[PDB]
Design a protein around this ligand. Structure first.
Ligand code: MG
Ligand code: MG
Ligand code: MG
Ligand code: MG
Ligand code: MG
Ligand code: MG
Ligand code: MG
Ligand code: MG
Ligand code: MG
Ligand code: MG
Ligand code: MG
Ligand code: MG
Ligand code: MG
Ligand code: MG
Ligand code: MG
Ligand code: MG
Ligand code: MG
Ligand code: MG
Ligand code: MG
Ligand code: MG
Ligand code: MG
Ligand code: MG
Ligand code: MG
Ligand code: MG
Ligand code: MG
Ligand code: MG
Ligand code: MG
Ligand code: MG
Ligand code: MG
Ligand code: MG
Ligand code: MG
Ligand code: MG
Ligand code: MG
Ligand code: MG
Ligand code: MG
Ligand code: MG
Ligand code: MG
Ligand code: MG
Ligand code: MG
Ligand code: ZN
Lengths: 129, 144, 155, 150, 81, 87
RNA sequence: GGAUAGUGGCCUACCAUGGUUUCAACGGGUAACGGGGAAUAAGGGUUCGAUUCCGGAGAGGGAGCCUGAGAAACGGCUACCA
RNA sequence: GCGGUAAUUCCAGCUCCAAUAGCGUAUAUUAAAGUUGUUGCAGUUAAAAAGCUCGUAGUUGAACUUUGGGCCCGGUUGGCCGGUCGGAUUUCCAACGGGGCCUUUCCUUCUGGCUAACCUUGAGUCCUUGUGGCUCUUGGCGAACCAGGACUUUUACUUUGAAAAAAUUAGAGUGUUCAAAGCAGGCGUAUUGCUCGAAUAUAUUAGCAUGGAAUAAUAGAAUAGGACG
RNA sequence: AGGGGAUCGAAGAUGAUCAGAUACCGUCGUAGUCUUAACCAUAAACUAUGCCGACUAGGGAUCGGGUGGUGUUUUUUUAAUGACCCACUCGGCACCUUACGAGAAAUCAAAGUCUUUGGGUUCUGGGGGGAGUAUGGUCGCAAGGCUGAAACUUAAAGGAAUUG
C-alpha cells in the first residue's frame, strides 16, 4: 500500500526526464507534493504544472524542460540540527555551488539555502539538482 | 527497499540485528567468547616461556622436502605442551633438553607458518640470551 | 481508594492537631484541615468535602509536592490508595539516527480525593519517599473515564 | 490489494463527479428517506436498500438526494442492527462453513477457509471495538456465533 | 509520445479507456425511463439492474439481471436520462 | 562558466537537443543536426541559409526522431498540420 | 508502632494481594570499578580507559564495635577463619 | 614461492636500497573494510528467501481543515556616490531577512494596576512652494507585564538560551635560542616603576527556559450526557 | 491399529553376465503400493528469484468477465437464442522483439528506475573445510524434525564465460 505519496511523485518526474518526456501525470498529489513541486519550479527545474480536481486526492500534470538530473526523496524524514544541514548537502549534492536539499521546517517547506538565510531547520524532505 | 527497516523508529530492530550478525565476524566472536584466554597455549599474551622436552625433526610439507628442526616445549604457566620451530641454520645446536626457552607466535594470527605442519610458534631465546645473538656470535650460552 | 468505613482501622484515624472540642456544640462534627498544594493545582472539592483521612494526600495530608511534575497514563489500580503509571518516550540512538519506544512504570500515591481508572492520563508531583517505591502523588486527573457511558445498550 | 488471496482485481464503482443534481431527478429528500425506512422496515440491509433504490427508483446515490448515508438514516430512525452489516455477513458465513466442517471433518480446504473468515472477523471486530460501535471486549466465539446471526 | 497533452485528451481515446483510467473518473452506466403500453406511466430503470425490476402496478417483469447491462423485457421501449 | 572576475573559462559550450534540451556530447556519434532550407518566392531554396534543428542520439535510438522533428518544424511554420498535440 | 540524624518494609504487628516482564523482566557471563578521557584522521564509525583530575570501594577474608562532629576506621580495638 | 650442480630467494664476500639514534620481531586493536553496510553490502546460478498460508508483539500506513490579497515598522550585508580629516551617515537603488496590522480570524479569562504606542490635537512651526520634523497636555489602543481570582486536550520535531571543573582537544596571543612545552611576558628614568595578558570554540542524550506551528501523531459533537447566555 | 491386498514391487532367494558382480538385465516375490482412524513434517517442497505499492517499451496469440456492431453463420416468416468475426477494456497462464536500463557474465519487463546510492516491511548470508558434526533444550512410538557450537585445519574452495 502507498507509503509515501511524495515518493511516487518524484520517481514519476524522474522517469519522465530519463525517458525524454516533457510532461507527467502524477497521482495522487498533496499539499506536500505541491510545495515540493513549487520549490523545484521557483528554481527552474520544472516548467508549469496543473492540479486537476478529481473529487478525491488530486492529480497533477507537470511540464518539465530537461534541466533536471535528479529529484529524490529522503525516506525517513530525519531531523536535521541546522548544523547537520552541511552534512546532508555534501552527502547528496553534486557540488557546493548549485543544487538544493529541500526540507520541512516550522517556517515552511523550504530549500536549505532559504533555510540557512531564515535561520531555521527541521526535518529533511528530499533534494533537487 | 530490500530488507532492512527504514522507519524512523526502527532503531532497536536495527541494533539487535547488527548484534546478531556480528557473530559471523571471526575476529569479533573470538574476542567475546574469550578464545584467547580459554584455548590457545599462551594466555592470550605475546610470548610464553617453557621448557624443552625433546628435539623434533618435523618433515616439511609438499611441494617441499626438508627436515624442519623444532622443539617440544612445556609452557611454564601452563604445563600446556607445544612444538616450536628453531629459526636459522644450526641453532638446534644451541638448544638442549630441559633448557628454558622463550616462545613467540609466527605472525599469522594463530595458524601454521609455511611448509611446517602443526607448528604455530618459534623460539626467540634460550637460557636467557636469544638465538639471534648466539647465531651472529655476539654472545654465549650461560654456564648451567 | 479508601471508600466507606473511614474508621476501619485498629487505630482511630484523625488529622493531627486538628482538635474538636466536645464542649463546644459544633454543626459539622469534625473540623477538617486542608491546603493549596501550589503550582496552581486546584485542591479538588472532594478533599474539602471529604471525611477520609490519608496522611499522604497532597491536599489534606502531611506531604508536599516539590521537584519533578510528570504526566503518565494509568496502567494499574489494584493497590489500595496507590497506582502505577506508564511513561512512554522515544529513545534516540545516534548511530542509526532513529529512535526506539521505551517505557518506565512509576508507582504513585493516589488520594481518595481522586477516582482514577486504568486508561486515564494523570499528572503527578514528586514528594518525599512515601513508601519503598513511591516518590510521586497524583495531583490532577487530565482525563475522566475515556468515554465509558458511550458504549451502552441498543436502541 | 486483496487481503486474503493473491487477487489483484482493481474493480469498483466509478462514482460521478456531480455531487448534487441529477436535475432529471425530481422527487425529494422527504420522499426517498421515507422510501429508505419502509424498506429497512421489511428487514433490508442498507446495501440491499441502496441497490433496491438504484434500480426500481431513480436513486443515483442516496447520499446525494438525501443529505445522509443509508446506514445513518436507519440509525436515526431507530432501525440499526445489533452489529454492523459486514460483520454480520462474515459471522453468518463462518457459521455456514463451520456447520459444514462439522459434517465433513475430512475437508481440509474448508478448515483453511474457516480460519481466513474468522481472521477477517476478528480483525474487523477489533476495528469496530476501537471506535465504540461495539462494546469493549465484544468478541466472536464460535460456540456462540450461531445464536448471534440466526 | 515524448510530448503530448495529458490535460486535453481526445474524446475518442478517452472513450475507449477504462472508467477508472479516464482523466477524472465517472461511470459509464446510464438510467432510462421504461414503459409497456398496457400501463400509462414510466418507471425508471438502471442499465445494470441486478434486481429484476417489477413494474409499478402490474407484476409483469421489465428487465432480468446479467453480467452487466440488464436485459429489458422483449416487448418494450425506453429513453436515456 | 565564468570565473573570479568576469573572464570566460572552460572551453567549449556543448550543443543541445532541440527536442530534450540535454547536452549532445562528443562521443554521441549517433546524434544529428538537420539543416532545413529557407526558401524564397516561387519555390527556389536560398542556398546557405537554414532553419536548423539538433537531435540527441538518445532520442533517435528511441525512435522518436520523426515525431519530435514534426512538432519542432511545425511550430516554426515548416509544417502545416501533420502533428497533433493531442492523443 | 518501633527504630533512625531523619524519609522509607528500614524493622515489627495487623490487614490486603500485590510488584516486574518480548519496549527482554528474571537468570548467566564479564580476563567490568564508573566518569573526564585515549587510539584510529573524508564522513558515519570501530576499539580502549587498572593508571596524574572528579566519584565509588577496599585494606588477607568475613562480622562486630569503642572513641568521636565525622569511622562500621584496620599504620583502632574485639571474635572467628586463613 | 625458492633449494634435486651454471640458486636473481639459502650460507657468505662485494656492491646496492629503505628508515636512521634508532631499526626488527611477537601479540592486540584501528585504518585499508561498502568483508557488519544508519550513511552503505549481498541473497536466480558465487555463502544466503522459511514448503505454504493465517497471525500477535514490532516496524509501517492515501488525500482533505487559513490559504490568498492589502497596508505599515524597524533591522544587515552590497552597490553607486563621500560629507570627510583608512571609515563616517542621509537620501537614489536593488537583495536578504525580523516584527506588527486589516482582511468573517482568542490574544485563556475576567477584576485594576502601567500605560508604549496614535484614530488623537492643543497651540503652531526649525525650515527646501510641505505631512519632510519632535518637543508638547484636557475627550479617544491594550495586552508590554505586573498580581489576585477563575480554567487550561496531550506529544514528537526544530530554534535560541540558561546551568554548566579543571587538565585533554580545537584554537588566539607570547620568539621557551628552535621545538615538544610553559603561561608567560613586554616597556622605561634598568636609583626606589610603567604596563598587555592569563582569550575563544566544542561541551550533543536527558532535565530546565524561549521562539517556530511545516511534517507526524493525540484528543473533540452522533442514543447529543454537545456548545455558548 | 483395522480392512484391502488385482498391479507393480525396497528386503530376501534365484538365472545369467563379470576377474569379481553383494549390481545393471531376467525370475520368484516379503513389506509396500489402495482405504479408515491416528502419527510423521520432510523433497532440486524449484521460478534454485519474499510480500505490498509506484513508475519505466513494443508485438501478436490465448483463458475469464464486461461494452460497442444497419459483422458472419444457424431458418421459420423475420426475430430471440447460440456458436463464430472485428474493435476496445479490466484481471489471468504464457510466448515474441527489443533495451532506454541492469549484471561477473549467462541473461533479465525485472534481476530496471543504485556511488546522481532512501516508498513500506519480513527473512537469510559474511572464505573453505571441521559440520548440520558435538552439547543442552524441545517435539516424535520410532525413524527422526526444530534449535545448534567450538578446538583444529586450510590458500583457496566457488561462479559465469573463453579458447583448447
Ligand atoms: Mg552460521
Ligand atoms: Mg611429540
Ligand atoms: Mg492491595
Ligand atoms: Mg491494485
Ligand atoms: Mg496479509
Ligand atoms: Mg467487483
Ligand atoms: Mg507501612
Ligand atoms: Mg500473592
Ligand atoms: Mg533480547
Ligand atoms: Mg574486576
Ligand atoms: Mg569500560
Ligand atoms: Mg578509570
Ligand atoms: Mg584489573
Ligand atoms: Mg574505608
Ligand atoms: Mg596482600
Ligand atoms: Mg560468606
Ligand atoms: Mg575494619
Ligand atoms: Mg589509613
Ligand atoms: Mg657456482
Ligand atoms: Mg650464487
Ligand atoms: Mg645475498
Ligand atoms: Mg616504521
Ligand atoms: Mg543516514
Ligand atoms: Mg560481501
Ligand atoms: Mg547457492
Ligand atoms: Mg520460495
Ligand atoms: Mg498522512
Ligand atoms: Mg544547545
Ligand atoms: Mg577552557
Ligand atoms: Mg501386495
Ligand atoms: Mg538382491
Ligand atoms: Mg550369483
Ligand atoms: Mg544383498
Ligand atoms: Mg529444507
Ligand atoms: Mg524446477
Ligand atoms: Mg507488455
Ligand atoms: Mg457481444
Ligand atoms: Mg601452495
Ligand atoms: Mg566449452
Ligand atoms: Zn407495466
Amino acid at each position: 500500500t502507498r507509503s509515501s505519496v511524495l515518493a511516487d511523485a518524484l520517481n514519476a518526474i524522474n522517469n519522465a526526464e530519463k525517458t525524454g518526456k516533457r510532461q507527467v501525470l502524477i497521482r495522487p498529489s498533496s499539499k506536500v507534493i505541491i510545495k515540493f513541486l513549487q520549490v523545484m519550479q521557483k528554481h527552474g527545474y520544472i516548467g508549469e504544472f496543473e492540479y486537476i480536481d478529481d473529487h478525491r486526492s488530486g492529480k497533477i500534470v507537470v511540464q518539465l524542460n530537461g534541466r533536471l538530473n535528479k529529484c529524490g526523496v529522503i525516506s525517513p524524514r530525519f531531523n536535521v540540527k541546522i548544523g547537520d544541514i552541511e552534512k546532508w548537502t555534501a552527502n547528496l549534492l553534486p557540488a557546493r555551488q548549485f543544487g538544493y536539499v529541500i526540507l520541512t521546517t516550522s517556517a515552511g517547506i523550504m530549500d536549505h539555502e532559504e533555510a540557512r538565510r531564515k535561520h531555521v531547520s527541521g526535518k529533511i524532505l528530499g533534494f533537487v539538482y | 527497499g530490500k530488507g532492512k527497516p527504514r522507519g524512523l523508529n526502527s532503531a532497536r530492530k536495527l541494533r539487535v540485528h547488527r548484534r546478531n550478525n556480528r557473530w559471523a565476524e571471526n575476529n569479533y566472536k573470538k574476542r567475546l567468547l574469550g578464545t584467547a584466554f580459554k584455548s590457545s597455549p599462551f594466555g592470550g599474551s605475546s610470548h610464553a616461556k617453557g621448557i624443552v622436552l625433546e628435539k623434533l625433526g618435523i618433515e616439511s610439507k609438499q611441494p617441499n622436502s626438508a627436515i624442519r628442526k623444532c622443539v617440544r616445549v612445556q609452557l611454564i604457566k601452563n604445563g600446556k605442551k607445544v612444538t616450536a620451530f628453531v629459526p636459522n641454520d644450526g641453532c638446534l645446536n644451541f638448544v638442549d633438553e630441559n633448557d628454558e626457552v622463550l616462545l613467540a607466535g609466527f605472525g599469522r594470527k594463530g595458524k601454521a607458518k609455511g611448509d611446517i605442519p602443526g607448528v604455530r610458534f618459534k623460539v626467540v631465546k634460550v637460557s636467557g640470551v636469544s638465538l639471534l645473538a648466539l647465531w651472529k656470535e655476539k654472545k654465549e650460552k650461560p654456564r648451567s | 481508594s479508601t471508600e466507606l468505613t473511614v474508621q476501619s482501622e485498629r487505630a482511630f484515624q484523625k488529622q493531627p492537631h486538628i482538635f474538636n472540642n466536645p464542649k463546644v456544640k459544633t454543626s459539622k462534627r469534625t473540623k477538617r484541615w486542608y491546603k493549596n498544594a501550589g503550582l496552581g493545582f486546584k485542591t479538588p472539592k472532594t478533599a474539602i468535602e471529604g471525611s477520609y483521612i490519608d496522611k499522604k494526600c497532597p491536599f489534606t495530608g502531611l506531604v508536599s509536592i516539590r521537584g519533578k511534575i510528570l504526566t503518565g497514563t494509568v496502567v494499574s489500580t489494584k493497590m489500595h490508595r496507590t497506582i502505577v503509571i506508564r511513561r512512554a518516550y522515544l529513545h534516540y540512538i545516534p548511530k542509526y539516527n532513529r529512535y526506539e519506544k521505551r517505557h518506565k512504570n512509576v508507582p504513585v500515591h493516589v488520594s481518595p480525593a481522586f477516582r482514577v481508572q486504568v486508561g486515564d492520563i494523570v499528572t503527578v508531583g514528586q514528594c518525599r519517599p512515601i513508601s519503598k517505591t513511591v516518590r510521586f502523588n497524583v495531583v490532577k486527573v487530565s482525563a475522566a473515564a475515556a468515554k465509558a457511558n458511550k458504549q451502552f445498550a441498543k436502541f | 490489494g486483496r487481503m486474503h488471496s493473491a487477487g489483484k482485481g482493481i474493480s469498483s464503482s466509478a462514482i460521478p463527479y456531480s455531487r448534487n443534481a441529477p436535475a432529471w431527478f425530481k422527487l425529494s429528500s422527504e420522499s426517498v428517506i421515507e422510501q429508505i425506512v419502509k424498506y429497512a422496515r421489511k428487514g433490508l440491509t442498507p446495501s440491499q436498500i441502496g441497490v433496491l433504490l438504484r434500480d426500481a427508483h431513480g436513486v443515483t446515490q442516496a447520499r446525494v438526494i438525501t443529505g445522509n448515508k443509508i446506514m445513518r438514516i436507519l440509525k436515526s430512525n431507530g432501525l440499526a442492527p445489533e452489529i454492523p452489516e459486514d460483520l454480520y455477513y462474515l459471522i453468518k458465513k463462518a457459521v455456514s462453513v463451520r456447520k459444514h466442517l462439522e459434517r465433513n471433518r475430512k475437508d481440509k480446504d474448508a478448515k483453511f477457509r474457516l480460519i481466513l473468515i474468522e481472521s477477517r472477523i476478528h480483525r474487523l471486530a477489533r476495528y469496530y471495538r476501537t471506535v465504540a460501535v461495539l462494546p469493549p471486549n465484544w468478541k466472536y466465539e464460535s460456540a456462540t456465533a450461531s445464536a448471534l446471526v440466526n | 509520445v515524448l510530448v503530448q497533452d495529458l490535460l486535453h485528451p481526445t474524446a475518442a481515446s478517452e472513450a475507449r479507456k477504462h472508467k477508472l483510467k479516464t482523466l477524472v473518473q465517472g461511470p459509464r452506466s446510464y438510467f432510462l425511463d421504461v414503459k409497456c403500453p398496457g400501463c400509462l406511466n414510466i418507471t425508471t430503470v438502471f442499465s445494470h439492474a441486478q434486481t429484476a425490476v417489477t413494474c409499478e402496478s402490474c407484476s409483469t417483469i421489465l428487465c432480468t439481471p446479467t453480467g452487466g447491462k440488464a436485459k429489458l423485457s422483449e416487448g418494450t421501449s425506453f429513453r436515456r436520462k | 562558466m565564468e570565473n573570479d572576475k568576469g573572464q570566460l573559462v572552460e572551453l567549449y559550450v556543448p550543443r543541445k537537443c532541440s527536442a530534450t534540451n540535454r547536452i549532445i556530447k562528443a562521443d554521441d556519434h549517433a546524434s544529428v543536426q538537420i539543416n532545413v532550407a529557407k526558401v524564397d518566392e516561387e519555390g527556389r531554396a536560398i542556398p546557405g541559409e537554414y532553419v536548423t534543428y539538433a537531435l540527441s542520439g538518445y532520442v533517435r535510438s528511441r525512435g522518436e526522431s520523426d515525431d519530435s522533428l514534426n512538432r519542432l518544424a511545425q511550430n516554426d511554420g515548416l509544417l502545416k498540420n501533420v502533428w497533433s498535440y493531442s492523443r
